[PDB]
């Protein structure tokens, strides 16, 4: 309705803000959201998926994967494991792999040039070390005059019972803008933050764990490398959900008095807006009902006989067009529920909530 | 701003930023998915906790906070304390089983990533099941639902990549839906293919006679037990329901609805009827020997339609006795003072 009764009340872009979050996913930082964009949290401002995504998972997600098998697979490896690669880290082989972002790095897979300091993946492949303590002897002929395999015998990501369970592919060099700890200790002020030397590990696993200002914790049982990304519980929501929240947390009286001041004192502009914004807050607050109801989570269903299903001629049935719309809603909503339970990749949830929204319209 | 585009852009965007590497990336996540399962199981084993419970708690800590448990499936599980306590015993698991915990989580996460990267796959498929009767958005969504199903049974031990695998699972979910929701009236799948068959048959039958084939042709052409009565019945179900609200006659304000009459409602005359019938019948019910008059009056007009089982304790001979002597004494003094004669029906 031209004066969006909800946009008027909730001082949000009267006509554009809503449209943006309501039907799509242009989140509005509902409560807190510590971490910055360059400025403090947007208490009631909106952001885009890109900037949003660039908040939760850390400042950068780069996955420059090298070509060939030796070239770039050697420049990075020598400076990826533990070696805190600074901004603009110039890897040196194909072209110039540009690690233009923060803290530490984690390389993915290796081919078959030289194996050293890696994980226990190939450990089983070449018995000697997994079988006995021969990894030291692994060093061919120089040993007579943690990992350090032979000069070069293996090739791809496999299980060596027999060369059956294999996987011959690339070598990703994904830079993860996150701070890596390996030997965190215990200080009992607050609840044990992080981890211990090697034994005790109180941290939640590789997913969502809140320590200090940094808020995500991945785990690598290789070295005691407790990966701690930094963003926090930035309450980000879109669609009627977000708005429902906002409308409930509102002491109309306050905004009634606030506007009272805003109305009479400042110049025409903002005070004019305030008057048109006071009318509704007044109506509601008056004999009127309480405004948390503009939200719909429970759709009444119009009577049956009023939306007949009748027999016409032979096999021809005739019904109110309303019934089709109802199924539209019913199905989506059902698909929704299934979709949340069965697991839920963001894209698909929203994409449906969108449809669901349109359906309700 | 007109849906379609936005969501297309939406995942084509995340796909465009993260497609899955033909092998490496696909195999990777996969291996992490299965071990998650193996983990949750072994967890369930060591904790005596339900795998469904192990699966939901790990999901929480990875996918969302109390927000996702509370609003979706109602608060059966304590938004905080419950899931927390659960996560606790997970920590208590020593260096051995703890390992699985960390595995379950990471696997679950791996799962998601696999799903995201293969959304375009759905779109391409679903893009061909367009004109079936479902919204393209609905078609992809269901197809998507199928993709996830595919993520439940894929065995990476069996070399063949996910691509071909999801194809089937999706298409299955798609067709299912198509036959399930695309109608104002649910009809079993069997009857669906049947109609197709008939339809297809009519086409070939529309190929030479130059006559829209009589229900004889169709019965013949289709096969075994096909008959005129059959075909006529099928096509009558095929036809989609028309709008109770439709332009009528000389296309004006006239709406189809006002044209359909009523039958339940007793139009005034029937109301009048019920009055006299009830009043008069009640006047005759009071002038009668209760026993076998009320038995049949109640057995016939009060419950359902059993001579022996009609009278309480007195057997059939006393039933037939008063039933046929009272009903006749009843019918004839009513023959005298003619009140019911004029068939109220
Ligand atoms: Mg309006
Ligand atoms: Mg505003
Ligand atoms: Mg910046
Ligand atoms: Mg900035
Ligand atoms: Mg706010
Ligand atoms: Mg992260
Ligand atoms: Mg940042
Ligand atoms: Mg160079
Ligand atoms: Mg840094
Ligand atoms: Mg490699
Ligand atoms: Mg090597
Ligand atoms: Mg090593
Ligand atoms: Mg051994
Ligand atoms: Mg020697
Ligand atoms: Mg020596
Ligand atoms: Mg020496
Ligand atoms: Mg020496
Ligand atoms: Mg091998
Ligand atoms: Mg093996
Ligand atoms: Mg081989
Ligand atoms: Mg094998
Ligand atoms: Mg190959
Ligand atoms: Mg102390
Ligand atoms: Mg240690
Ligand atoms: Mg511990
Ligand atoms: Mg302790
Ligand atoms: Mg921290
Ligand atoms: Mg910390
Ligand atoms: Mg309060
Ligand atoms: Mg406020
Ligand atoms: Mg106050
Ligand atoms: Mg004030
Ligand atoms: Mg409301
Ligand atoms: Mg509302
Ligand atoms: Mg009916
Ligand atoms: Mg009916
Ligand atoms: Mg007609
Ligand atoms: Mg109507
Ligand atoms: Mg899943
Ligand atoms: Mg996602
Ligand atoms: Mg989409
Ligand atoms: Mg979207
Ligand atoms: Mg692109
Ligand atoms: Mg088992
Ligand atoms: Mg037990
Ligand atoms: Mg809630
Ligand atoms: Mg639930
Ligand atoms: Mg307990
Ligand atoms: Mg204990
Ligand atoms: Mg999973
Ligand atoms: Mg279509
Ligand atoms: Mg197998
Ligand atoms: Mg197969
Ligand atoms: Mg099914
Ligand atoms: Mg055929
Ligand atoms: Mg054709
Ligand atoms: Mg025919
Ligand atoms: Mg038919
Ligand atoms: Mg007319
Ligand atoms: Mg008209
Ligand atoms: Mg009408
Ligand atoms: Mg009609
Ligand atoms: Mg009318
Ligand atoms: Mg009727
Ligand atoms: Mg009449
Ligand atoms: Mg009468
Ligand atoms: Mg008697
Ligand atoms: Mg008697
Ligand atoms: Mg009877
Ligand atoms: Mg009967
Ligand atoms: Mg009987
Ligand atoms: Mg009896
Ligand atoms: Mg009896
Ligand atoms: Mg009885
Ligand atoms: Mg007796
Ligand atoms: Mg007689
Ligand atoms: Mg007599
Ligand atoms: Mg008579
Ligand atoms: Mg008399």
Swiss-Prot record, chain A:
Q: Which family does it belong to?
A: Belongs to the RNA polymerase beta' chain family.
Q: Describe the task this protein carries out.
A: DNA-dependent RNA polymerase catalyzes the transcription of DNA into RNA using the four ribonucleoside triphosphates as substrates.
Output this protein's name.
DNA-directed RNA polymerase subunit beta'
What is the native source organism of this protein? Thermus thermophilus (strain ATCC 27634 / DSM 579 / HB8)
Subunit structure comment from the entry: The RNAP catalytic core consists of 2 alpha, 1 beta, 1 beta' and 1 omega subunit. When a sigma factor is associated with the core the holoenzyme is formed, which can initiate transcription.
